Amino acid sequence: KSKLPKPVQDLIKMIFDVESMKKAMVEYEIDLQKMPLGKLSKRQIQAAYSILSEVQQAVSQGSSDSQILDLSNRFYTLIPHDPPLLNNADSVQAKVEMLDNLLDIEVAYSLLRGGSKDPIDVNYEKLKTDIKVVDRDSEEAEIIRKYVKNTHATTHNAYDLEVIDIFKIEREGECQRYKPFKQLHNRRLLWHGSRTTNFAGILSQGLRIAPPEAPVTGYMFGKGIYFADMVSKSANYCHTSQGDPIGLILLGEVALGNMYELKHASHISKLPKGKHSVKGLGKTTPDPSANISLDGVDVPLGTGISSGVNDTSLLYNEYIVYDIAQVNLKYLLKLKFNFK
Ligand SMILES: NC(=O)c1cc(F)cc2c1C(=O)N(C1CCN(C3CCC(F)(F)CC3)CC1)C2
């Protein structure tokens, strides 16, 4: 049996569930016959990003129907489906999203196949990630639950949110990596939602930035790591429905430094001198007054009020850093989405 607390065990079971890895591949219409879980590779997914960039190159340079046809055939040969022609940005970005997921799904599966005590404990160790349970009645839980209740958006009213488990997390190497970036202040505790099938990869390797091979557009603020101060904006990237009421989310410590504050999409080739992050400005913001501190870290847990920011792409804020070392992952939440 396992020495880990039941909540930690149930987390490992959820993160390394091989069924749900398969299920999402079916959802993406991958031919599991032509390509099962075992046959996914980094090199395969890498070249598929490159084909997608080539599609976008062609579309912008307005290539001929057969040149676009050739490229789609190459893509669907590299990633066999059970299909949409890739001729516009929207279909290309749909495929990026898939590859991002599959990239993580591959990482999760490579972990189980590696290595030689309960399987649960052996798995936990492959994560190189300290996971401890935060007690329901603790100070951390009171603040976290308030952060959740208060930063739930009014337009995200298709579900109610309930915190089931809260975990203190410490990724191996991350602290040594993060230390120098504490020098810039404006450190804040922020949300990052993702698919459950991604979390094995997220804990093994932390939050990573898009690979250079991937196509450049689709990204509002370039290739960086993206955060929210409203819980539900991040909760939407959990992609949970009826069959999955359980999602996972991260609270991370982000060292924002001097924020380059924007209202419209820009392709951040380079941050301006003395700027260390980007903040997209929403129509709705957490109350600036109600900001709280937790262990030297600012927590924007105020009820979302109307910010006077007009003529902006975004309804809610978002934060983006461009060095992976600027993130320190602190908490992992398990959430029940209670639908209606
Ligand atoms: N992860 C988050 O919680 C999050 C929070 C935010 F406030 C904003 C964002 C995220 C998040 O994950 N974001 C991603 C969502 C996916 N986009 C792009 C979608 C189009 C693409 F072409 F596939 C490139 C990737 C990149 C940013 C934005």
Side-chain angles (χ1 to χ4, degrees):
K1 277 160 198 159
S2 169
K3 308 303 143 200
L4 274 20
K6 187 160 173 292
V8 178
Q9 289 182 30
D10 280 317
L11 187 79
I12 308 300
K13 279 153 149 270
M14 187 182 293
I15 275 169
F16 283 101
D17 183 38
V18 183
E19 168 71 356
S20 40
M21 302 194 199
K22 270 163 190 164
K23 163 87 173 302
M25 290 187 78
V26 164
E27 283 172 30
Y28 286 133
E29 295 162 339
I30 315 299
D31 191 25
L32 263 75
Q33 262 277 130
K34 263 282 172 178
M35 192 172 74
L37 277 167
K39 283 302 159 79
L40 284 150
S41 69
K42 316 186 228 296
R43 35 271 155 204
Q44 167 189 62
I45 300 160
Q46 189 172 143
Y49 280 122
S50 279
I51 291 168
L52 292 188
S53 290
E54 269 176 58
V55 176
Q56 204 194 67
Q57 285 288 319
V59 174
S60 301
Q61 292 175 140
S63 295
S64 62
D65 279 356
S66 84
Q67 196 170 316
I68 263 78
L69 196 69
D70 167 66
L71 285 173
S72 298
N73 290 340
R74 280 173 67 196
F75 179 82
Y76 293 115
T77 290
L78 203 48
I79 282 89
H81 283 57
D82 192 308
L85 211 219
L86 318 174
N87 59 359
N88 61 55
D90 326 309
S91 58
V92 160
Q93 296 160 7
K95 294 290 184 279
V96 182
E97 274 167 65
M98 181 202 72
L99 291 180
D100 293 356
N101 192 3
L102 288 186
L103 188 160
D104 274 319
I105 279 170
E106 181 275 321
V107 171
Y109 200 77
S110 278
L111 278 179
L112 291 169
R113 286 302 148 282
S116 196
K117 53 188 296 165
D118 201 301
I120 285 178
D121 293 3
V122 189
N123 288 336
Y124 169 84
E125 291 177 24
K126 317 284 268 302
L127 294 170
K128 316 261 83 187
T129 295
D130 185 58
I131 307 177
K132 295 283 157 61
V133 171
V134 171
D135 190 86
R136 157 192 48 257
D137 289 309
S138 62
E139 166 83 337
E140 287 157 287
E142 289 206 6
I143 292 161
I144 285 164
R145 282 196 306 268
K146 172 157 251 54
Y147 202 169
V148 171
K149 200 202 87 183
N150 284 11
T151 70
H152 202 298
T154 43
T155 63
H156 301 145
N157 67 344
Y159 61 88
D160 291 300
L161 229 20
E162 182 177 285
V163 184
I164 274 70
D165 294 324
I166 304 154
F167 304 87
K168 249 281 186 188
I169 67 183
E170 177 163 352
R171 285 194 62 253
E172 200 217 303
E174 195 155 75
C175 179
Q176 212 85 305
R177 198 178 73 162
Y178 180 71
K179 272 190 197 196
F181 295 90
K182 302 167 78 54
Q183 302 317 296
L184 332 158
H185 198 242
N186 200 45
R187 291 176 281 143
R188 304 187 192 174
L189 199 73
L190 297 166
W191 297 111
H192 187 92
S194 211
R195 275 164 174 260
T196 308
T197 30
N198 296 329
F199 277 93
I202 284 171
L203 298 167
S204 320
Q205 281 159 51
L207 296 170
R208 290 132 297 157
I209 299 152
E213 305 95 46
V216 280
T217 335
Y219 295 96
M220 196 159 288
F221 297 106
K223 292 174 178 181
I225 306 155
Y226 286 65
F227 293 95
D229 54 41
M230 305 282 286
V231 74
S232 60
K233 173 167 197 164
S234 265
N236 293 335
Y237 299 101
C238 295
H239 268 262
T240 46
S241 38
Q242 278 283 21
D244 267 309
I246 301 298
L248 297 178
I249 202 162
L250 293 159
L251 281 159
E253 185 188 334
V254 202
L256 300 154
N258 196 34
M259 297 179 300
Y260 184 32
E261 308 177 26
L262 305 172
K263 314 143 103 290
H264 295 290
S266 174
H267 311 289
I268 288 90
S269 54
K270 222 174 198 299
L271 277 167
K273 315 277 179 173
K275 309 280 192 187
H276 313 111
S277 67
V278 160
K279 176 185 177 199
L281 299 181
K283 311 216 190 202
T284 280
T285 190
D287 195 338
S289 151
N291 270 28
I292 255 167
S293 192
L294 175 72
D295 293 344
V297 182
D298 203 38
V299 182
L301 55 68
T303 51
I305 56 170
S306 188
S307 76
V309 185
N310 41 229
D311 102 296
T312 168
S313 303
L314 309 149
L315 290 149
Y316 307 103
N317 290 325
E318 60 189 65
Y319 306 73
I320 308 92
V321 279
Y322 300 92
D323 194 324
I324 52 161
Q326 282 191 263
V327 187
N328 188 239
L329 303 172
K330 286 233 153 210
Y331 300 96
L332 193 153
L333 271 68
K334 172 170 162 174
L335 293 163
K336 162 114 85 179
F337 290 77
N338 224 286
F339 284 102
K340 180 164 170 169

